[PDB]
């Protein structure tokens, strides 16, 4: 009668003292990749689409204002509360991603290179993933906790702060992870879920880019653009790095968002959503669940703005209408337009994802809100309703990979660092803009007959190659970001990185309000709404160890 109290053993699990064993280390690695597919839900998408509703690219959509009103607050910047469940959830969910990356790192740290030669490669893979999650937390909250000690015991997590490091030192700690990945990932990864060395370079550049626009004040205002941080962006966007892993622009723009065309040369790193895979309904991108159009019965979230639509117009010789684009609404008949439009937003009268069996209409069939949020549809994450990749669970979803880094992003981030350095390498920066802008004008592979069938007048031209003043250059770079990356949920983060988020979002608020009534009372307050508040529940549980953001206490 004490042998008796010890007989029953846990069933169906591994216990903490056996899980660091070598036989499980690659299991833990896969697990950390897995949570990027399985760790989000419809209100917490790791694409961050839910929060890019703040940007001038999209509306919230849905039945009306009452449908996710917590996301209507974000979209108009009024009524956001520190207590909101969605903010707390996205914070919680990305730190869960870090748990698996660290749990594997803890086990990988104990391996012998002599007996496990992929050690540093696998370690590189895990710090990459750890960087990806810290990076997104940083975009979302500014004042993040740097959880990068994988040998830290569960109790030491109670004494961490989000002010242990200055804003600049936080960005550096994210960069340090990506740095290790660059120095250790292989040049090619047969297994395409794992990032290659060029993916690490590209993310390392992206993070030194965001780190360059300093907010070293006590607030969110810009305190300068640091030269040497920009010079790291140039170093790690080097085409000689990108060539070594085979990355390049797709010959047609649409190929980045089509199931037939996953893992092309422009997909530098992507989340490998999958189907017919043993899981209950497929590792589909359930996070995009709310985004599908009303023609599937639900739910009609994430709808393009008339502003974004108008940004695609061109000027009789194939260039943006820099100061006039949004005066009149786009008219297919009389206006020149950019081919990227028809791969970004589905307009009425035109085929939904290239399928002339479904023509979008100004209908109760195509807008859940009977006109409130307009009648536009997000293409980049939806698919042909006849795809074999589309399944229904709680919501409709697909196996379409989500591209975290598109090779165009490398080219445009490289041009941004060059423009902002001003070493007379601005022309170099414009030929990179041209690489991206030329591809667009040729990307009519799937809509070549819209001139005949609908009267679309495509015209997009490269820029004349000459000297440009820097503010003019930036204006062209920002604009090329706009038409290349619409509805990819980076727009607001840019606006904040550039320090002009209050100015253009407010202008957009006054501008869009005439076309969409949810903005009638909108209002962005500077040095507050650039970032999400750190969740009240998180501050509460820290025992005074976390500090809030400027404008929030």
């Amino acid at each position: 009668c004490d042998d008796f109290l010890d007989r029953q053993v846990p069933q169906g699990i591994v216990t903490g003292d056996q899980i660091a064993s070598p036989e499980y280390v690659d299991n833990l690695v896969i697990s950390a990749y897995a949570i990027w597919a399985t760790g989000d839900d419809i209100n917490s998408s790791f694409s961050l689409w839910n929060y890019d509703v703040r940007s001038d690219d999209c509306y919230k959509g849905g039945s009306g204002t009452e449908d996710g009103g917590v996301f209507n607050a974000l979209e108009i910047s009024k009524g956001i509360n520190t207590t909101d469940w969605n903010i707390n959830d996205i914070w919680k969910r990305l730190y869960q991603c870090i748990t698996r990356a660290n749990t594997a790192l803890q086990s990988l740290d104990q391996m012998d290179e002599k007996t496990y030669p992929l050690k540093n490669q696998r370690i590189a893979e895990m710090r990459f993933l750890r960087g990806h999650a810290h990076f997104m937390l940083k975009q979302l909250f500014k004042k993040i906790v740097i959880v990068n000690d994988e040998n830290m015991e569960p109790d030491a997590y109670n004494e961490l702060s989000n002010t242990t490091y200055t804003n600049d030192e936080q960005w550096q700690k994210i960069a340090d992870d990506f740095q290790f990945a660059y120095d250790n990932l292989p040049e090619v990864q047969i297994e395409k879920g794992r990032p290659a060395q060029a993916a690490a370079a590209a993310y390392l550049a992206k993070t030194y880019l965001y780190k360059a626009y300093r907010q070293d004040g006590a607030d969110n205002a810009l305190t300068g653009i640091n030269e040497e941080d920009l010079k790291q962006v140039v170093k790690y966007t080097d085409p000689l790095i990108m060539a070594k892993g085979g990355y390049g622009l797709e010959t047609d723009y649409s190929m980045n968002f089509l199931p037939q065309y996953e893992n092309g040369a422009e997909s530098v790193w992507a989340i490998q959503y999958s189907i017919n895979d043993g899981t209950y309904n497929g590792n589909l991108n359930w996070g995009m669940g709310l985004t599908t159009p009303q023609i599937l019965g639900c739910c009609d979230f994430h709808k393009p703005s008339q502003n974004l639509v108008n940004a695609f117009k061109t000027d009789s010789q194939g260039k943006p209408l820099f100061s006039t684009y949004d005066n009149e609404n786009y008219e297919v008949a009389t206006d020149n337009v950019d081919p990227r439009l028809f791969h970004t937003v589905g307009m009425p009268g035109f085929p939904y994802k290239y399928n002339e069996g479904y023509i979008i209409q100004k209908n109760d069939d195509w807008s859940r809100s009977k006109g409130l949020y307009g009648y536009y549809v997000s293409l980049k994450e939806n698919v042909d309703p006849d795809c074999d990749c589309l399944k229904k669970g709680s919501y409709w979803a697909s196996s379409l990979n989500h591209i975290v880094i598109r090779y165009a992003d490398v080219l445009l981030m490289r041009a941004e660092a060059l423009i902002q350095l001003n070493d007379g390498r601005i022309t170099d920066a414009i030929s990179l803009i041209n690489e991206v802008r030329s591809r667009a004008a040729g990307s009519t592979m799937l809509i070549f007959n819209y001139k005949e069938d609908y009267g679309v007048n495509f015209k997009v031209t490269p820029y004349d190659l000459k000297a440009y003043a820097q503010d003019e250059a930036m204006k062209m770079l920002k604009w090329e970001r706009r038409v290349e990356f619409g509805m990819e949920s980076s727009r607001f983060f840019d606006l904040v990185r550039w320090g002009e988020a209050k100015d253009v979002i407010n202008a957009y608020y006054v501008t869009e309000a005439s076309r969409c009534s949810i903005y009638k009372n909108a209002g962005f307050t500077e040095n507050k709404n650039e970032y999400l508040p750190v969740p009240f529940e998180q501050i509460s549980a820290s025992n005074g160890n976390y500090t809030q953001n400027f404008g929030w206490a």
């Binding site: 053993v9 846990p10 069933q11 169906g12 699990i13 591994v14 036989e23 499980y24 299991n27 017919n276 043993g278």
Partner: protein, 793 residues
Amino acid sequence: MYQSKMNVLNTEQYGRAMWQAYVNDGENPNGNALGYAYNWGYNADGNPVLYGMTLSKYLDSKNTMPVADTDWFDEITRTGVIQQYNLSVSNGSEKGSSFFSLGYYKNLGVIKDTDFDRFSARMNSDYKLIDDILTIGQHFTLNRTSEVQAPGGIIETALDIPSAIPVYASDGSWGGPVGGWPDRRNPRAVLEYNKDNRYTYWRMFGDAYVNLTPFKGFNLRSTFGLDYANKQARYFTYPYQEGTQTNNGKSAVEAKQEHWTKWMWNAIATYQLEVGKHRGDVMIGMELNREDDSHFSGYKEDFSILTPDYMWPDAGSGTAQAYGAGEGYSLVSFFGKMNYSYADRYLLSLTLRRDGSSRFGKNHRYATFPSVSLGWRITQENFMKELTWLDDLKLRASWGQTGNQEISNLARYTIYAPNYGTTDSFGGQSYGTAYDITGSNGGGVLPSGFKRNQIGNDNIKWETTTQTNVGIDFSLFKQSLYGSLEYYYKKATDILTEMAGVGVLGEGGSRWINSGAMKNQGFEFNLGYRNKTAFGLTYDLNGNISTYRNEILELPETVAANGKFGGNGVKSVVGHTYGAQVGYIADGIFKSQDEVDNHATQEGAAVGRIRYRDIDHNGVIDERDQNWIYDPTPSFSYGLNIYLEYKNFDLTMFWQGVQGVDIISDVKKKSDFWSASNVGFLNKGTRLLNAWSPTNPNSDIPALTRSDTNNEQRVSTYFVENGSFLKLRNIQLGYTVPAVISKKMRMDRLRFYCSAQNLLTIKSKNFTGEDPENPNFSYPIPVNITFGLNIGF
């Protein structure tokens, strides 16, 4: 303990035999694929003689598997031990009674890594309300059982695997075959992998009844019954890689569940009445029966930790399958009986029963069965006064019908099943309905459909058995010489069988049909002699000898040529006994080429082969050279029981015999041929080493050969043997402790017994198997010694 077994070849005998089969075929025996090197040559008369043979230390060039002389049968068997304990208590009281039993039973089987245990509790009671006109009662019992069953055919596969393969590899891993050795896994290793597959079986069954007696002779009784059992288990699949045997790295677990609930209800009304001489009893009743069954499981592959604790479906990472179904049947039953006796001299009883069964369509759902039983007690008659040496002489005569209804619950249906192809199956043969119609190559749900399991029968009906027996039982002297002489004649009509279909009809042609008539008539005659000796000894000797002959009367023309009931598809068994067989007649062994030419031309005929008879004298041996060569009817069957009491000891012997009976077996294909088998190089019996040879010319056993050119696997008298036997089913001796010393302990009876089952067997000399009563097996029934007590307070 297993007493004997078919002796199989050891590593040297196996090496000797293969050599003989080689040189018998004029082949270089040193070119064998199994690593034997033979020192041999020709004698003085020019005939192969084996001088010596060597064997590698290891079976494979890489030296992972050492050469062995394993006795596999001794390796997977052991002494079984059984232990039972039962404790009962009963209470008798004016106004009711109650009973209570606890029991335990634990079998460690004779087969390693098997075991079995049964907890049991019974509790019954009755309650006399309205004292002796209204009575309420109950029986209930409750059993928990748990067991690791052996795998099917574990023993035979241990006699099949050659003795050269070791139990353990060079390190401690499980041994196996390398190279050309048979594709058969290690039987010991199979048991170890089976050792955790344990089911847990819970069963309860009881009944509750009310009995109303409204006046003197009347009785109304209703009974409700319930029988619910459920079986639960996990079957574990572990990786293996033992020589060439391999699982790849498979691991899985199947969590199986089964349920059987059976409920019963009846009402019965009985009336008895007695008027001087006349006594009469009438009885009517009804009984509804239902049984509902269901099973289902979950299967999942790939487990990080190969232990039962870890291996639940939640923990698997590979693919999953889900299985399960259910079936059921219901029975309605109406019945009546009428007993009458004039002067305890003339008895008469009548009986009528309508039975209905959901296994038939409405058009044959019920069948009605009557009986008449008649009785005359001679010695009670007045004219029998004079015979004092005759205590009783009863003469009974009966006629009754009963029905057969044991068939599939879906016997009458054309059954289409979806059968996508999710169940294991050997070497193919899924018969799945899923197909890659698009050319994808898979990676998804395939389109699929339906396949036929059987064809229905709108006209399936009850099998009816009409039975007639007349009897004469007696007793003479003063109940010292009791006996009985019976004669029965049972004839079955519309016999039910699942009968397969013709080939060209194809998949799912099997049908449940009524097919023909049988007849079985015989003689039973039991005789006894009981008497004390007045010298302290009581003997009670009870015998029985029976004969029977069996015969098929009608058969649909298609079934008679099929051969289901006998005749092997070459002759109809109509007018013959059930299971009788037609085959070739084995006429010995060709001993010279002249004897080959001097015989009807037959394909494989050669020196040392089996000569088969030319039944029709056409000069060739072909498919017509067959006749009736096997009849299962024994000439008679007997049984004698000896009982002795002496000085409180008691001795009991039960003998049972069967005389003059054909048996038919495949055993000889393993014991008498190197090659009478689809799979090569298996271990064989030891009778081979007396096979025919120039060196060994006067033997019934054909010459060893690597090829069955002569088709000696043909149905022939070579496989028919004298299966007559006589055995001691049970012998038992016991001491009963005299109450002068036992009630010492406030205990009434106290008895010790020692008993033995299946100890002795006497066979025919020309029988060459293990046990003539079970001629298909290469192993006997193991002997049991038991020691027991029956203390009784």
